[PDB]
Design a protein around this motif. Structure first.
Motif, PDB file in Angstrom:
ATOM      1  N   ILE A 182       4.865  12.598  10.450  1.00 18.23           N
ATOM      2  CA  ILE A 182       3.700  13.476  10.476  1.00 18.23           C
ATOM      3  C   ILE A 182       2.731  13.110   9.361  1.00 18.23           C
ATOM      4  CG2 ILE A 182       2.947  15.859  10.165  1.00 18.23           C
ATOM      5  CD1 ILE A 182       5.676  16.654  11.572  1.00 18.23           C
ATOM      6  N   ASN A 183       3.258  12.821   8.169  1.00 21.68           N
ATOM      7  CA  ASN A 183       2.396  12.456   7.050  1.00 21.68           C
ATOM      8  C   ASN A 183       1.712  11.118   7.291  1.00 21.68           C
ATOM      9  OD1 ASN A 183       2.545  14.153   4.270  1.00 21.68           O
ATOM     10  ND2 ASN A 183       4.336  14.530   5.573  1.00 21.68           N
ATOM     11  N   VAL A 184       2.446  10.151   7.839  1.00 21.76           N
ATOM     12  CA  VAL A 184       1.836   8.881   8.210  1.00 21.76           C
ATOM     13  C   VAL A 184       0.662   9.125   9.147  1.00 21.76           C
ATOM     14  CG1 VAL A 184       2.213   6.824   9.650  1.00 21.76           C
ATOM     15  CG2 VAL A 184       3.858   7.396   7.786  1.00 21.76           C
ATOM     16  N   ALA A 185       0.851   9.998  10.137  1.00 24.73           N
ATOM     17  CA  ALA A 185      -0.216  10.228  11.105  1.00 24.73           C
ATOM     18  C   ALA A 185      -1.426  10.840  10.434  1.00 24.73           C
ATOM     19  CB  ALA A 185       0.269  11.119  12.247  1.00 24.73           C
ATOM     20  N   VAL A 186      -1.221  11.676   9.410  1.00 25.95           N
ATOM     21  CA  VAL A 186      -2.369  12.277   8.741  1.00 25.95           C
ATOM     22  C   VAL A 186      -3.173  11.202   8.018  1.00 25.95           C
ATOM     23  CG1 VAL A 186      -3.034  13.687   6.794  1.00 25.95           C
ATOM     24  CG2 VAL A 186      -1.519  14.645   8.580  1.00 25.95           C
ATOM     25  N   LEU A 187      -2.488  10.386   7.219  1.00 29.02           N
ATOM     26  CA  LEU A 187      -3.148   9.316   6.477  1.00 29.02           C
ATOM     27  C   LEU A 187      -3.864   8.359   7.416  1.00 29.02           C
ATOM     28  CD1 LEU A 187      -0.301   9.052   3.910  1.00 29.02           C
ATOM     29  CD2 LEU A 187      -2.720   9.028   3.274  1.00 29.02           C
ATOM     30  N   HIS A 188      -3.187   7.957   8.495  1.00 28.46           N
ATOM     31  CA  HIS A 188      -3.754   7.007   9.448  1.00 28.46           C
ATOM     32  C   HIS A 188      -4.977   7.594  10.149  1.00 28.46           C
ATOM     33  CE1 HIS A 188      -3.951   4.309  12.957  1.00 28.46           C
ATOM     34  NE2 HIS A 188      -3.883   5.398  13.702  1.00 28.46           N
ATOM     35  N   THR A 245       0.849  -1.181   0.000  1.00 27.82           N
ATOM     36  CA  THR A 245       0.000   0.000   0.000  1.00 27.82           C
ATOM     37  C   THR A 245       0.887   1.234   0.000  1.00 27.82           C
ATOM     38  OG1 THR A 245      -1.601   1.280   1.338  1.00 27.82           O
ATOM     39  CG2 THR A 245      -0.188  -0.312   2.506  1.00 27.82           C
ATOM     40  N   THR A 246       0.542   2.211  -0.844  1.00 29.78           N
ATOM     41  CA  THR A 246       1.312   3.449  -0.890  1.00 29.78           C
ATOM     42  C   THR A 246       1.138   4.269   0.380  1.00 29.78           C
ATOM     43  OG1 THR A 246      -0.535   4.457  -2.099  1.00 29.78           O
ATOM     44  CG2 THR A 246       1.346   3.620  -3.389  1.00 29.78           C
ATOM     45  N   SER A 247      -0.013   4.148   1.046  1.00 30.82           N
ATOM     46  CA  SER A 247      -0.284   5.019   2.187  1.00 30.82           C
ATOM     47  C   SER A 247       0.588   4.685   3.394  1.00 30.82           C
ATOM     48  CB  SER A 247      -1.761   4.960   2.577  1.00 30.82           C
ATOM     49  OG  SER A 247      -2.117   3.655   2.975  1.00 30.82           O
ATOM     50  N   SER A 248       1.228   3.517   3.415  1.00 29.41           N
ATOM     51  CA  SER A 248       2.266   3.282   4.417  1.00 29.41           C
ATOM     52  C   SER A 248       3.492   4.185   4.238  1.00 29.41           C
ATOM     53  CB  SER A 248       2.690   1.812   4.380  1.00 29.41           C
ATOM     54  OG  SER A 248       3.643   1.578   3.345  1.00 29.41           O
ATOM     55  N   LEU A 249       3.616   4.878   3.091  1.00 31.23           N
ATOM     56  CA  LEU A 249       4.738   5.767   2.792  1.00 31.23           C
ATOM     57  C   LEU A 249       6.062   5.007   2.804  1.00 31.23           C
ATOM     58  CD1 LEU A 249       3.962   9.199   4.382  1.00 31.23           C
ATOM     59  CD2 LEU A 249       2.984   8.029   2.393  1.00 31.23           C
ATOM     60  N   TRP A 250       6.024   3.749   2.356  1.00 29.68           N
ATOM     61  CA  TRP A 250       7.237   2.941   2.341  1.00 29.68           C
ATOM     62  C   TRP A 250       8.307   3.551   1.444  1.00 29.68           C
ATOM     63  CZ3 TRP A 250       8.788   0.776  -2.333  1.00 29.68           C
ATOM     64  CH2 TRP A 250       7.828   0.618  -3.334  1.00 29.68           C
ATOM     65  N   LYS A 251       7.916   4.152   0.313  1.00 32.49           N
ATOM     66  CA  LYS A 251       8.922   4.722  -0.575  1.00 32.49           C
ATOM     67  C   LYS A 251       9.660   5.843   0.125  1.00 32.49           C
ATOM     68  CE  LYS A 251       6.634   3.690  -4.960  1.00 32.49           C
ATOM     69  NZ  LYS A 251       6.278   4.208  -6.305  1.00 32.49           N
ATOM     70  N   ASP A 252       8.907   6.736   0.772  1.00 35.40           N
ATOM     71  CA  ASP A 252       9.505   7.858   1.479  1.00 35.40           C
ATOM     72  C   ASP A 252      10.424   7.383   2.591  1.00 35.40           C
ATOM     73  OD1 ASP A 252       6.589   7.944   0.693  1.00 35.40           O
ATOM     74  OD2 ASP A 252       7.048  10.104   0.592  1.00 35.40           O
ATOM     75  N   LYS A 253       9.988   6.374   3.364  1.00 30.46           N
ATOM     76  CA  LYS A 253      10.795   5.889   4.483  1.00 30.46           C
ATOM     77  C   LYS A 253      12.085   5.234   3.995  1.00 30.46           C
ATOM     78  CE  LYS A 253       6.935   5.079   7.687  1.00 30.46           C
ATOM     79  NZ  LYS A 253       6.071   4.043   8.345  1.00 30.46           N
ATOM     80  N   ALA A 254      12.006   4.393   2.960  1.00 27.74           N
ATOM     81  CA  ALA A 254      13.215   3.780   2.405  1.00 27.74           C
ATOM     82  C   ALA A 254      14.173   4.825   1.825  1.00 27.74           C
ATOM     83  CB  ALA A 254      12.832   2.752   1.337  1.00 27.74           C
ATOM     84  N   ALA A 255      13.654   5.812   1.090  1.00 27.09           N
ATOM     85  CA  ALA A 255      14.549   6.811   0.513  1.00 27.09           C
ATOM     86  C   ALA A 255      15.268   7.622   1.578  1.00 27.09           C
ATOM     87  CB  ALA A 255      13.794   7.765  -0.420  1.00 27.09           C
ATOM     88  N   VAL A 256      14.610   7.921   2.704  1.00 29.68           N
ATOM     89  CA  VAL A 256      15.302   8.700   3.728  1.00 29.68           C
ATOM     90  C   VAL A 256      16.502   7.925   4.259  1.00 29.68           C
ATOM     91  CG1 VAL A 256      15.106   9.479   6.100  1.00 29.68           C
ATOM     92  CG2 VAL A 256      13.519  10.336   4.391  1.00 29.68           C
ATOM     93  N   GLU A 257      16.335   6.622   4.499  1.00 28.70           N
ATOM     94  CA  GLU A 257      17.437   5.839   5.047  1.00 28.70           C
ATOM     95  C   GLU A 257      18.572   5.656   4.036  1.00 28.70           C
ATOM     96  OE1 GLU A 257      17.709   5.541   8.098  1.00 28.70           O
ATOM     97  OE2 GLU A 257      15.650   6.121   8.510  1.00 28.70           O
ATOM     98  N   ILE A 258      18.263   5.629   2.737  1.00 26.43           N
ATOM     99  CA  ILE A 258      19.311   5.548   1.704  1.00 26.43           C
ATOM    100  C   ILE A 258      20.157   6.813   1.714  1.00 26.43           C
ATOM    101  CG2 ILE A 258      19.665   5.595  -0.820  1.00 26.43           C
ATOM    102  CD1 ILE A 258      17.206   3.553  -0.786  1.00 26.43           C
ATOM    103  N   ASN A 259      19.510   7.965   1.872  1.00 22.95           N
ATOM    104  CA  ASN A 259      20.231   9.220   1.970  1.00 22.95           C
ATOM    105  C   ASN A 259      21.063   9.291   3.246  1.00 22.95           C
ATOM    106  OD1 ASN A 259      19.441  11.718  -0.082  1.00 22.95           O
ATOM    107  ND2 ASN A 259      18.010   9.972  -0.179  1.00 22.95           N
TER     108      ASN A 259
END
Ligand code: HEM
Ligand code: HEM
Ligand SMILES: Cc1cc(N)nc(CCCN2CCC(F)(F)CC2)c1
Ligand SMILES: Cc1cc(N)nc(CCCN2CCC(F)(F)CC2)c1
Ligand SMILES: C[C@H](O)[C@H](O)[C@H]1CNc2nc(N)[nH]c(=O)c2N1
Ligand SMILES: C[C@H](O)[C@H](O)[C@H]1CNc2nc(N)[nH]c(=O)c2N1
Ligand SMILES: [Cl-]
Ligand SMILES: [Cl-]
Ligand SMILES: [Gd]
Ligand SMILES: [Gd]
Ligand SMILES: [Gd]
Ligand SMILES: [Zn+2]
Lengths: 401, 401
Positions: free
Chosen positions: B323-329, A310-324
């Motif tokens: 913060i964005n996760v919390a909004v979606l959730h 699911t995109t709403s887990s924001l997995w892409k955003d979370k993975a990209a932050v850790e790569i940076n």
């Protein structure tokens, strides 16, 4: 004159420098094309006249005896030869202005600190190679990177161009695959095939450094292997995710653009490679996470145990932050200069303030200045910008093949 | 003369032929691009003919009896009265076209599903309030949001206009202090001071829903308290950071824009509030984290125990994602429609493809379509776009004071 607002502070300025914009861009009042990546002695003279006036302004000798003499000299040289030659200090000033004038560069707080190597006496592809090796050696400096440009001979009537066929001095091969995929960097498939066609025995890794294809005037390109110890690289690890080292990822220390044209006073230097140091998002977000580059995003997210269905887990955003995080950490551990997108955008805001004072404005391409992650968390997001072309300049040019 | 447009993730090329129609010429010139700037008598017949022609082509009924007849009536009305009234279906079709033409709207895949309430027979701020109240409760629909626009009477010479003084139908108060700084939303300190000035008893809280200031032609405005059971709000909690609820954050359910001027066929409706549903970055990234908005970023980072002592820990990026996760959730748990920026941008790419076939292009403002976090992780980042003005349109307009 355009009125420009910063939306975080409220401040307002006017870009008077924009009215001096010489060459034209791709927009009209009908339509804006800002987001597009790639949009005669008399004209040579007027270009040259304007650069000379710039130069004599910078050294506080506008309208002086030496100023008129140089104008008169340039017109006489263009009359007798169809071209003219830059004095060494004009070349140094012209290279710094080209960087200063580059709208898509967020690093320009540094523009005055630039080492200019004058290779205009270069005689062959073999000598070209030696100048390039010394550039890489000086600029890398064992990880304490220094900004530099090497300037090879100008375009001139009667002879072909010096060209570096490689888009950067350091690039990883991209091997088209059995099943149609790419091994290595997909951005570099074309130059990789050219290297093989020109005698290079390929590898089959994902991080194989490419050789240089160097073109002397009216010559086929020539292949030159870079000495392994001149290419400083950084294995990528994560400060807390220990499995990250097992991805086997690496990047090189030195960003050295080698396919752009340097234009100063109407003269064109099709070979003038330049280098600075990386902003971490170029490596971590673009080069590693672009779907058409190394495309590691989903593999990292799976390893992090994120919910990738699911995109709403924001997995892409979370993975990209850790790569940076891993890029920054790895370059800091290796003691290789690197700047994060918050420090870089903050320093660019100071540059805009210095440039408003010094020149009455500053050319800037908003879509390129705002980093590709966390855009509105950086101050440049909230800054309106005016984009235009000033000369001296770095220009794009077609690939020589 | 037909802009070539590339998508860099796939390599595909299209041509924006639709751009050849652009009416209200934008801010850019060949000399300078201003794409990043936020806010950059019988001519009425010209825009009327053109809009009527639009309407009949869209129903596959150009050049046939019902078309010519409607052409003469608008002629006769403007000859007799100096203006004209829109047929019901025309008003419906123009509202949808104005949405479809909005270059800054990422949600235009929904353009064909829009509920139009015709409020053109309105008189006085009390009638507006019941019209606005009917819109809000219809659009909110117990959290199953439905896009809607209410069209108040058009503008005519000599007599004042209908205006909603609030930028949105739901806004939070912003109160200054014994020291200038603001409790509540700093985006609304102006209209908060006008509401207090016009008789409203302010609260103390950081999330007090402001009253409405509704203005009938030539009369002073009137305050209206919104029914508390009609303002659907969502308390913000995080799925796993149990302290996030304690920060006491909320946002409202309905994004309803009440300060833009709807323009159809040369007619101007300065009161035409429209609404849809939120993309989650709008709330969690812009409204809550912008330095000049609620500015909550560091407070969340302190709670997450992040190292705010160096920007290269990417603590801003980490707190912003959570913060964005919390909004979606929170919106999901309240069963209120919301869309995340990955889902939204993916649908916009589909919209671009639809519109390429239907109209040969799509006006799109790259800097506004790309989301304010994780920009290059969404497909629109890698899509070149062309920006231009088509009619009918939503336009900005001066504050009514
Ligand atoms: C000192 C550290 C530097 C930093 C941190 C920096 C930063 C950046 C970044 C992030 C970009 C965008 C690149 C992309 O997305 O592909 C860029 C582009 C560019 N930089 Fe800088 N830069 C630095 C040094 C330099 C130097 C030394 C020069 C020339 C003397 C230069 C000239 C340019 C130009 C011409 C571009 C445009 C590239 C293009 O249009 O494709 N930069 N810079
Ligand atoms: C239904 C789901 C919708 C979504 C997800 C959506 C999303 C967005 C977003 C994220 C923006 C950027 C605005 C900002 O950053 O402040 C925007 C702008 C805009 N939208 Fe949509 N929207 C929706 C519905 C609508 C509707 C129903 C209309 C009109 C009938 C509309 C017309 C506009 C206009 C005119 C703008 C420009 C706003 C401005 O310039 O401040 N949108 N939209
Ligand atoms: C000097 C420098 C510093 C830096 N930190 N990053 C770069 C990246 C530039 C990449 N850019 C891509 C398009 C191109 F190939 F046409 C020209 C080069 C360059
Ligand atoms: C319809 C809609 C949907 C959505 N998801 N988001 C919005 C936000 C628009 C915010 N925009 C700010 C500037 C303004 F006040 F001038 C006009 C309103 C609107
Ligand atoms: C199409 C779009 O303009 C393109 O993806 C741009 C956007 N902004 C960018 N910004 C930077 N710094 N580098 C890039 O390569 C791009 N790519
Ligand atoms: C200065 C800059 O144009 C400004 O901050 C813009 C950038 N892009 C945006 N994009 C959206 N969707 N909304 C905005 O408010 C802005 N602000
Ligand atoms: Cl790179
Ligand atoms: Cl909002
Ligand atoms: Gd660990
Ligand atoms: Gd693996
Ligand atoms: Gd604690
Ligand atoms: Zn433009």
């Amino acid at each position: 004159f355009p009125r420009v607002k910063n939306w975080e502070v409220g401040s307002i300025t006017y870009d008077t420098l924009s009215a001096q914009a010489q060459q034209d861009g791709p927009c009209t009042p009908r339509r804006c094309l800002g987001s597009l990546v790639f949009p005669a002695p008399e004209q040579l003279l007027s270009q040259a006249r304007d650069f000379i006036n710039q130069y004599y302004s910078s050294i506080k000798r506008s309208g002086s005896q030496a100023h008129e003499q140089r104008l008169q000299e340039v017109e006489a040289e263009v009359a007798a030869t169809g071209t003219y030659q830059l004095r060494e200090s004009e070349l140094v000033f012209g290279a710094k202005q080209a960087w200063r004038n580059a709208p898509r560069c967020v690093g320009r707080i540094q523009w005055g600190k630039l080492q200019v190597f004058d290779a205009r006496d270069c005689r062959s592809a073999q000598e070209m190679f030696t100048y390039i090796c010394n550039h890489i050696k000086y600029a890398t400096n064992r990880g304490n990177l220094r900004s530099a440009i090497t300037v090879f001979p100008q375009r001139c009537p009667g002879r072909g161009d010096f060209r570096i066929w490689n888009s950067q001095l350091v690039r990883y091969a991209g091997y088209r695959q059995q099943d149609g995929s790419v091994r290595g960097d997909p951005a570099n498939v074309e130059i990789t095939e050219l290297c093989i066609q020109h005698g290079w025995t390929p590898g089959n890794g994902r991080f194989d450094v490419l050789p240089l294809l160097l073109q002397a005037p009216d010559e086929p390109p020539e292949l030159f292997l870079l000495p392994p110890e001149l290419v400083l690289e950084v294995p990528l690890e994560h400060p807390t995710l220990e499995w990250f080292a097992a991805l086997g990822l690496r990047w090189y220390a030195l960003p050295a653009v080698s396919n752009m044209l340097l234009e100063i006073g109407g003269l064109e230097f099709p070979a003038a490679p330049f280098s600075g140091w990386y902003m971490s998002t170029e490596i971590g977000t673009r080069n590693l996470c672009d779907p058409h580059r190394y495309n590691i995003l989903e593999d990292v997210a799976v390893c992090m145990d994120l919910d990738t269905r699911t995109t709403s887990s924001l997995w892409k955003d979370k993975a990209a932050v850790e790569i940076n995080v891993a890029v920054l950490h790895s370059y800091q551990l290796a003691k290789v200069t690197i700047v994060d997108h918050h420090a870089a955008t903050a320093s660019f805001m100071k540059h805009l303030e210095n440039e408003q004072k010094a020149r009455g404005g500053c050319p800037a391409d908003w879509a390129w200045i705002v980093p590709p992650i966390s855009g509105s968390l950086t101050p440049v997001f909230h800054q309106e910008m005016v984009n235009y072309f000033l000369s001296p300049a770095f220009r794009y040019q077609p690939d020589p093949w």
